[PDB]
């Protein structure tokens, strides 16, 4: 029921030729709305959702300046992190961070997040209170100490209560048809004989939004957790998601098995068997 505005930021210190030194993608819930990057110091921006056509030119001009300033700052931060971690100058290193704000059904603010990683591992996290920080080691402890002495989380809260809230409100209004929706899964069980005489049962779920889903197989009175093969949920490319879960079973016992599907768009767990 709640909704989130989320940005996923990456900076790279020695990118390959043609590769971005900085890139960020923005989402509302599970729908991407833009790409920003900087390649050889040139900032670029592209829309990815149809409601972005309603943004005024002033939106993109302000965004362009933010992209230039962020990329310069992340580059400087990568230089400092190399020194504090006693690392060599030749290699390429990675700085990632996530920024988000969350509202409830009635558009009331519920929370926000700021979290950063260096070379793929947690570095620092802003806590639930939006005032204190959680570090992982003595380098990030220095960062925490400086952020809390400076009171720097004040300025993140002002971003959350200002531009983050403004954009989430406007995007939920202009993109209402795409964003304020739940598409239920269309589900079926497929049957595949195997060369050795047993059978693969594959339970499919297609065409659902949002992405979060659960698929489970169950045998009469026996738990099949370790038995099933479950693929990571995956985009179909049209704005919906798909997934399957499979078990191998003896020929003739297919009706002992049941697939259960749980999704926001269903009124209750759906139960499926191989029909035949």
């Amino acid at each position: 029921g709640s909704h989130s505005l989320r940005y996923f930021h990456t900076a790279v210190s020695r990118p390959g030729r043609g590769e971005p030194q900085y890139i960020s993608v923005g989402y509302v819930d599970d729908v991407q709305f833009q790409r920003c990057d900087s390649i050889e110091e040139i900032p670029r921006m592209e829309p990815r959702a149809p409601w972005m056509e309603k943004e005024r030119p002033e939106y993109w001009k302000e965004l362009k300046l933010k992209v230039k300033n962020i990329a310069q700052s992340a580059r400087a931060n990568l230089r400092t992190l190399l020194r504090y971690y006693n690392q060599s100058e030749g290699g390429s290193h990675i700085l990632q961070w996530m920024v988000s704000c969350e509202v409830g059904p009635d558009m009331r603010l519920l929370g926000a997040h700021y979290q950063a990683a260096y070379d793929g591992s947690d570095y620092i996290t802003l806590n639930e209170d939006l005032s204190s920080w959680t570090a992982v080691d003595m380098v990030s402890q220095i960062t925490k100490s400086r952020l809390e002495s400076a009171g720097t989380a004040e300025y993140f809260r002002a971003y959350v209560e200002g531009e983050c809230l403004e954009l989430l409100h406007r995007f939920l209004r202009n993109g209402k048809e795409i964003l304020q929706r739940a598409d239920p899964p269309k589900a079926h069980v497929a049957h595949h004989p195997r060369p050795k005489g047993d059978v693969t049962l594959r339970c499919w779920a297609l065409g659902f939004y949002p992405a979060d889903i659960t698929l489970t197989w169950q045998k009469d009175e026996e738990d099949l957790t370790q038995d099933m093969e479950l693929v990571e949920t995956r985009p179909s490319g049209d704005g919906t998601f798909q997934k399957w879960a499979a078990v191998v079973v003896p020929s003739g016992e297919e009706q002992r098995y049941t697939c259960y599907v749980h999704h926001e768009g269903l009124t209750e767990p759906l139960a499926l068997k191989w029909r035949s």
Partner: peptide, 7 residues
């Protein structure tokens, strides 16, 4: 579109 200097 927000960034905090880590150091």
């Amino acid at each position: 579109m927000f960034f905090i200097n880590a150091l």
